């Protein structure tokens, strides 16, 4: 299980197809796309999920069906969301798609008729689900919870398997691949843990290094790390993290420290930088995409020695707060749930082009 | 109570006199049985009492004149080592007295909050 997709220099980024869809929702939190016929699934803070057809790369996503919650589902086993949904994840069989958020419920839906096929309570008043992760070509859903709990589910039986413990702040970002392991960040412990479910082992990597030593580097030739906002798993042996100070740390599983550390990508603006609100690495490739409220998607290409990465380009057509990046292939199409505010409701400092919708870009070869 | 290490010891002439005749180190004898850092302090009345035991006991005098031991004093003409350490310990709750004098020994038993000492470094709590 190692990286085999070397296609970064082929990418037609400078003439990529740029488009954007305005949608009927306020502050979208996550976009989820299925690839075997193609689909998309969007949740917002307006308690709405929307199903999309994206199989035509030449045009915008096709609005198909929509489901909206409300105060009618306040009782927790009511089959409907009453509070804001933080995440959405299509199941790898295409049969189901699951939503969950501040309502402390994970409500999974059939993709056919958009009917609530199961509601699952978290059974904890602080167990808000921030992110969901399916194992690739499997039915094991990894639920990130706000009470420092990680609840793992089997979809076809609609059951609870086990819970993982250990993080010291809330689990913001989790990623998983086809093997039974997942990377989690708590982001204010600033320690990211890998999780082997059968091996019953975890790996704790440590961030939050002091900028004082960087002052010596300023003598040799910054910004504080408090929140390692996102994480993305590249392959079985390496991954990447995104912080609140432009630092995108390239990580190996054998190294307690990052094998590489990216200082500011999206830039600044006594001085304040941007954060890293979105990060998508398409698996087993040499390439990954960063997104923020800076207004452009900075795409970077990993070196083949797995030691550093190099910039491929930007997408300057997506003005607003990028909350989730999805990429489908066949030719490449890039969808992004861009919003006026942050997923966890964090404040925006006069973002240029505050808008809700989906940005798309087609890159060839 | 407010008890914390390090410990503030008060040492008279008679304690050292039995220490040298038994060949047991003063500060090392304390820190082994106190198991923590000590604060060795000597008043001038202990040193002025050594002025008359001098012609036979210069050995303890040069033993007293070490940089390990911190200076303590009173500014009076005629006060002693006994009654000066009566009233300093009276207006505090943190001193320890290293001695073997039986007369000052009962005076420790009157004021609560003060540990006791003995033959050369066997500690006795309050």
């Amino acid at each position: 299980g190692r990286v085999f997709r070397y296609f970064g220099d082929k990418l037609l980024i400078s003439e990529a197809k740029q488009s954007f869809t305005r949608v009927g929702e306020n502050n979208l939190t996550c976009i989820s796309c299925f690839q075997p016929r193609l689909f998309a699934y969007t949740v917002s803070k307006d308690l709405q999920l929307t199903k999309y057809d994206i199989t035509d790369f030449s045009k915008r996503p096709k609005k198909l069906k929509y489901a909206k919650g409300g105060a009618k589902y306040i009782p927790n086993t009511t089959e409907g969301h009453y509070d804001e949904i933080l995440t959405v994840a299509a199941s790898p069989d295409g049969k189901y798609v699951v939503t969950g958020g501040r309502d402390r419920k994970l409500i999974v839906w059939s993709t056919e008729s958009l009917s609530p096929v199961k509601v699952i309570p978290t059974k904890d008043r602080r167990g808000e689900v921030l992110s969901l992760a399916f194992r690739k070509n499997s039915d094991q859903l990894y639920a990130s919870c706000a009470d420092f709990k990680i609840r793992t589910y089997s979809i076809n039986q609609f059951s609870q398997l086990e819970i993982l413990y250990g993080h010291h702040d809330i689990v913001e970002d989790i990623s998983a691949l086809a093997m039974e392991r997942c990377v989690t960040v708590g982001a204010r412990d600033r320690t990211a843990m890998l999780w082997k479910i059968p091996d019953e082992t975890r790996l704790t990597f440590r961030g939050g290094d002091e900028p004082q030593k960087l002052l010596r580097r300023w003598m040799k030739e910054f910004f504080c790390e408090g929140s390692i906002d996102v994480v993305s798993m590249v392959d079985d042996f390496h991954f990447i993290t995104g912080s609140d100070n432009g630092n995108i740390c390239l990580w190996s599983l054998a190294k307690k420290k990052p094998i590489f550390t990216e200082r500011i990508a999206h830039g600044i603006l006594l001085l304040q930088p941007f954060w890293i609100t979105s990060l998508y690495a398409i698996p087993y490739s040499n390439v990954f995409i960063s997104g923020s409220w800076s207004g452009s998607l900075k795409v970077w290409k990993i070196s083949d020695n797995l030691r550093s990465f190099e910039l491929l380009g930007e997408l300057s057509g997506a003005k607003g707060v990028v909350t989730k990046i999805q990429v489908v292939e066949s030719k490449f199409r890039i969808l992004a749930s861009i919003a006026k505010e942050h997923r966890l409701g964090r404040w925006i400092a006069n973002v240029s082009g505050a808008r809700n919708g989906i940005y798309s870009a087609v890159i060839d070869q | 109570q407010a008890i914390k290490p390090p410990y503030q010891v008060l040492i008279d002439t008679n304690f050292i006199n039995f220490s040298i005749q038994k060949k047991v180190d003063i500060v090392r004898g304390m820190m082994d049985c106190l198991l923590a850092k000590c604060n060795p302090l000597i008043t001038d009345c202990v040193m002025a009492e050594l002025e008359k035991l001098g012609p036979k006991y210069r050995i303890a005098l040069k033993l007293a004149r070490d940089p390990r031991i911190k200076r303590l004093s009173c500014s009076h003409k005629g006060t002693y080592a006994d009654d000066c350490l009566v009233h300093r310990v009276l207006q505090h709750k943190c001193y320890i007295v290293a001695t073997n004098d039986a007369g000052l020994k009962q005076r420790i038993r009157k004021i609560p909050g003060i540990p006791l000492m003995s033959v050369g470094g066997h500690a006795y709590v309050i």
Binding site: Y165, G166 | Q1, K4, P6, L35, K37, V125
Partner: protein, 175 residues
């Protein structure tokens, strides 16, 4: 544990009533076990003080002495230079028990009611419901201190004694 040398020492017996009333204890041998645990540790700290600086016995076991105390929560970060473990106090040990730390994390409203909670198969550390009041908290499971899925105030069952009051109403006022 071990007995002290003096059985009747009044100001010593004063503070034993202070701490056990503070920390909600029930035995003086409970105090004697903590001092005897301290007695062997504070013994061995003097032995490495007799060794040379950068001594690999002093480097290996002396810093493993540090890491066992940084784990349990007693040793602070600034005082990590082998001398504060000679200038210690016993209340730092009594601080690190889970009997008081659940009360330090509110929720107990008495040092004696907290002991009542512990013995009734309440608070799980993680998934592990613990019934031992001397746990010496790991310093990283502190925010994970939370009620069981059962044993209400953690929910999911009212329990039969609340069901009797449910039965005393639903059968008398009902049928």
């Amino acid at each position: 544990y071990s007995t002290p040398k003096r059985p009747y020492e009044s100001s010593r017996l004063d503070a034993e009533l202070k701490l056990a009333g503070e920390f909600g204890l029930k035995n003086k041998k409970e105090i004697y076990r903590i001092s005897f645990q301290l007695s062997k540790i504070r013994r061995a700290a003097r032995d490495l003080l007799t060794r040379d600086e950068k001594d690999p016995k002093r480097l290996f076991e002396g810093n493993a002495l540090i890491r066992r105390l940084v784990r349990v929560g007693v040793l602070s970060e600034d005082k990590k230079k082998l001398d504060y473990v000679l200038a210690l106090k016993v209340e730092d040990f009594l601080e690190r028990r889970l009997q008081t730390q659940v009360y330090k994390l509110g929720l107990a409203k008495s040092v004696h009611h907290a002991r009542v909670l512990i013995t009734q198969r309440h608070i799980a550390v993680g998934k592990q419901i613990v019934n031992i009041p001397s746990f010496m908290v790991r310093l990283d499971s502190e925010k994970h201190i939370d009620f069981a899925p059962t044993s209400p105030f953690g929910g999911a069952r009212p329990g039969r004694v609340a069901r009797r009051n449910a039965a005393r109403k639903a059968e008398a006022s009902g049928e």
